[PDB]
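Quick question: what would this complex look like in 3D?
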Amino acid sequence: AGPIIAGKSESSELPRVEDRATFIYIEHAKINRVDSAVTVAEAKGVVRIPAAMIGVLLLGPGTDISHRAVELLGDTGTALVWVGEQGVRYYASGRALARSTRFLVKQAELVTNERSRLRVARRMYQMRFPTEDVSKLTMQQLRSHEGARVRRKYRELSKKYNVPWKKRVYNPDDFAGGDPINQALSAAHVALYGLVHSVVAALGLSPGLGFVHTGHDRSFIYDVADLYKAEITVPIAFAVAAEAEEGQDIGQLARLRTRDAFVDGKILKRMVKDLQTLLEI
Amino acid sequence: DRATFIYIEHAKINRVDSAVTVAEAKGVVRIPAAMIGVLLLGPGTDISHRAVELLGDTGTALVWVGEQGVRYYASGRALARSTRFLVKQAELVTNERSRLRVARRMYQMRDVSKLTMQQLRSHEGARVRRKYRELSKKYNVPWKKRVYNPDDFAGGDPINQALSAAHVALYGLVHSVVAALGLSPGLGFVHTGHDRSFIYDVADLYKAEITVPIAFAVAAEAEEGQDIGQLARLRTRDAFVDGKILKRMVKDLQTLLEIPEEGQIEAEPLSLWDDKEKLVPYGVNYSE
Amino acid sequence: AGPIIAGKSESSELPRVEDRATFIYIEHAKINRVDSAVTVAEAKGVVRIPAAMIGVLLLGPGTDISHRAVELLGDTGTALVWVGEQGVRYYASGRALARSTRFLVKQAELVTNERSRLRVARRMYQMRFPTEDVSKLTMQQLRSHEGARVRRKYRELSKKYNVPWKKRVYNPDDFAGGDPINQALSAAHVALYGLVHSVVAALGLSPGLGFVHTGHDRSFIYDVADLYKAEITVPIAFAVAAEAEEGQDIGQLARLRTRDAFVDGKILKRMVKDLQTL
Amino acid sequence: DRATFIYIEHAKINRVDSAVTVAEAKGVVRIPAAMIGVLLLGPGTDISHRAVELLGDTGTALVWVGEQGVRYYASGRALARSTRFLVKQAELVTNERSRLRVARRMYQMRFPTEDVSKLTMQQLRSHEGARVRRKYRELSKKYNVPWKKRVYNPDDFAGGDPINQALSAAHVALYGLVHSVVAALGLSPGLGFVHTGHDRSFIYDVADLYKAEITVPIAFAVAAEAEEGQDIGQLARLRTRDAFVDGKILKRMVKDLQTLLEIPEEGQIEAEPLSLWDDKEKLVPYGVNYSE
Amino acid sequence: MPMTVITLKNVPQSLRGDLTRWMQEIATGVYVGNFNSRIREYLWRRVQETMGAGEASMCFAARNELGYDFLTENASRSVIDYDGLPLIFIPKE
Amino acid sequence: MPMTVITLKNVPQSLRGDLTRWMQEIATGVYVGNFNSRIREYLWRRVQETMGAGEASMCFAARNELGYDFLTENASRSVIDYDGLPLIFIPKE
DNA sequence: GGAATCCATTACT
DNA sequence: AAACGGAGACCTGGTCTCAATCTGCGTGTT
DNA sequence: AGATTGAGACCAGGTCTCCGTTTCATGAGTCTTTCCCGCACGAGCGGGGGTGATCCCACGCGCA
DNA sequence: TGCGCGTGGGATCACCCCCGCTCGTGCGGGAAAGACAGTAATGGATTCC
């Protein structure tokens, strides 16, 4: 091919969305690009994140990121998500990773048709709950029926793992993260939230096209993430809350447990394999 | 209906209580974030996570670009957490009846009511062919023909390199603009099959008016012995400094999407070190 | 464990016998030990041999090997064979890699008993030709069977590849020949001869306790090599000579293809199982 | 039926026309290959391929040993490529009746004056433990070295009694040559009679015929003549290797191995431990050339 | 996925950081990662032209006994085969 | 079948030639080879005890999505676990 | 017969 | 406000060469 | 003689700083179809490896 | 000092762990032609120098 220069590479030279790691949490560091390399710099020293195999590069509190750093990360295709306490805060992404918009245009056909929207919206449920029939359940009931089911799973947890539950379904907009239980689930939740945004920009899908959540440009993310919302991360993170000790940071070990759940559950393989089925390709 | 497009380069942004704090070499700027929608973050800028904390609350969109959009690098959320613009784009692209209407509207922006998609496409090639012929004699330059190697830019004609360098600047600007507005570059009307399909469709509006004369101008004064992609980039940089192009483009997208005039949003540039007198009455503290 | 010293290691540190490479072919160079490293100093430079992953090493004409190098190689379990022209010249082995002698003591019991030697020879032959039934057959007419079949295998393969013959059967003793087929047979064969010598010493099995052959201290390796030479080394030995052109190093081409034959045939894993059942 | 256990160290060897040459610092010599029975290759020696091919056809046993055979490193084929001793060993070890015979035979050299040919293995090993206590005690009082009990640790060589460290080093020093002759004669080191289950099992049984006569007297002597803070492992090897210089002990193993294997006296070969500069006058009349 | 390792010396500092996006830097001029066949070829292709005047050698899983093979260009140590076996050759200075 | 690379700096020359019996030398102080779990663990003990005062690090395949993990002893380039990932850390003076 | 011109003659965007 | 290329400049750390040294790494009835 | 150690010279590569120069590596007037390249899952799925148990003298020693 | 075994101690016969699972498929990726409604350059039909 043509000349290859530092920081620039074709999508062929870069690993596919499946062969990459999940995420990295960052806190109190400056992200600067030196010698054409992303370098997260802390007080003690510098660490070179291997961007090529990063799903999403989570960004925490008290951190600074330069301009060429975002450009270098965008070229790699790793998503950038700003998170702190009380829930997720901001999203970012590069241009793309796949040059074919076939996935996007197929999604465009599906969203516009009301008949097509109802077909796919019901099909969320049997991927969430394969033992129930939603063949004759309307769009309005979908919001209410799934709204009760997500609450039921949490209620089952409270009596199961023997730890108090605040009865607060995760709403990322100005969420209540006071009690250590809440940050554990939220930090677990933002891990997939960054992951879901990471793959969607990689495959060319647009987060604006909503299925069950509507009104915001992150509607598609809030729906795909809802597919695996309670199946994988919720039992693992809540079980972490049961195995809680004092004198250590809950977030770091909880994030580690979500990592093991993600690799054990093959979330990256399952999620895109679904989207291929979800688009009838 | 008020949209603020602010370009920041060679500076640093932090937060104190509720406003972003630009720390450029001239001084400290205290723009409130309650009325900010776009941060055209230029080269060599530093953003603080605390600053990003507020911008999410107001629906402000972040875009990372080069010299005021000469190239597009990355973006974020949309204006005021609004996805209606993209929704109409999806509606306008599925059925070919809507697709043909906007495609015909795109051509007349550059008779259209009877030309079909292939019929429209041939004319655009004809008109663009005449435009190259006209400027070649107008600028008295020896343009043989548009011959280009996509994977070999160094080996090529200076005029061909000039157009290639000039064009790629334009797509970056529109991509930065369209990403902020909340649309999707994949959903193209005439162009289709690429992640920037919508980009090359919209950018065709201003290729003849802006970039092509710039590419021919730099080629006319081009001297053998130096690169011209840098020269073409700067000749686009100053042309993009004014920001009247962005004002035209945001209106064109609303017209292209048949946005009602009442619902149409007007966007204007804000140069912090050049529009000080305008920003002071809105509650901005300036320091040196 | 105790202290660790450079140049010395336990059996556990060394890899398993069948998990290593087969052989290397070294000529016109001096083998020395510098900085606790087996090194081959050729005319233009030096190379370092990963002795842990090496089964048997070979030495051709015009080479020199130092006393310290021998013991360093012997510690790793890699045996030494002086691969001169006209076939094998001499052997060399170090301490047995295997700590126990349960394999060795069982071999002694089987080899010394005439009926057990008969039974083992029955097992040895049927691996070569499983189709035939050798329930009632003794030592004297065995040697007729293998010798004829090897000749028959040699003849039919020669015509299949159209190579001239001198009607000779290959033995590593008192061999000779200027025709390219002569050294092509030797070079391919000797790698098998070296490989079996290394592994048999690694397992702790003495080479003098042969069954088909008897009369020398390397009888056992000859008998084991007889089991696999017809199956493996002979087809390539004829194949490489026919494929080779004039003015070319037949041995380099010959040894290269035999290494592939050792890989795909799973010879190392197979024979250790074969020695297990013998 | 004479085998030459000639020792080579600090020299280069090659081939000129038909006889092996030696390139030691003192001079260059041209010993014929026919005379060579066994080359005890010591430290600081290199071997040329042309020498080996001239040595392979004549059946010479090339053994790589330590300084004067203090240690064993590696070896090639047996002398004259024969294996009659090894096959004899296998026959005499497979059956208990010969195992009874040879096991009592070894104790006969252990107790030349006392007949224990009727004592079973349990009594033989029992009375074997009796003599070792006396020999340690008797030599302890002779050299005024305080002796308590055989105490050591294979995983901890440094943390040992100076008497024990010398004793352990002395046995390993003798283990060298006694394994070298076994490999030179082609015997299987694995097939041991008293000791069984280790690749050196045959070596320990043969070496025990000389441990009470060489190693223990040397080890006790070294322990007395040793100052604090000085490592004795090299001292024990150096003191032992002095006894190997003459080679008189070397003939003893050669004769003994035939005696243990019940080889007929005519078939009992006897080795001659030659040395280059020790027997210059002896080699020259046969046809050896000595050049400065 | 099979492992891969890259070595570098006397190379412009632009590349020394660029490859760190793919493979981390355990030591000076040493990079390690787990890549398939397609990805590794393109990265080696990247180092093919931007190495400048220096050394670059790479190792990866192969289909021989040792299970790895070497590729070198403009290298102090050439790679020589002994009957199909990759062994490092250090030329005499 | 797993792969393992070992890097060294400022170590006695006795050990530098020692792993040449297990590894090969693609570059100075850089050794690479293929082991199982048992052989690699045992050898890492050897380079741990004999290196004395020096630099020693190694890369080996692991059970994480990165596909490998890091073990370091007396290493300037330490390793920091970002919730289950091995990343090379370089202290700054 | 061939040049100049037109439309086929052939072919570029 | 970053961030990279070129020109030192200084350093450790690897490598070669020349005396001095040892022949080598230790279990086998307590 | 060969190999190791140590002391000492020696010098190339790495790294740091300082100064200067950039804000960059450069397509599509047009999409569609079709020949090369794919690598994870589907079908019945038993050859390996980690290791408890234990022998019989090694460490040590008690009565005799 | 006579006499053996109280703790081992790791290979090894063989026990239960593992995926068993590797070629074809078919699912996406290419890349190169190949269309699609237009001029430009140029040569035969027509007529004139």
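Answer marked as accepted. The two ends of chain A are 31 Å apart (CA to CA).
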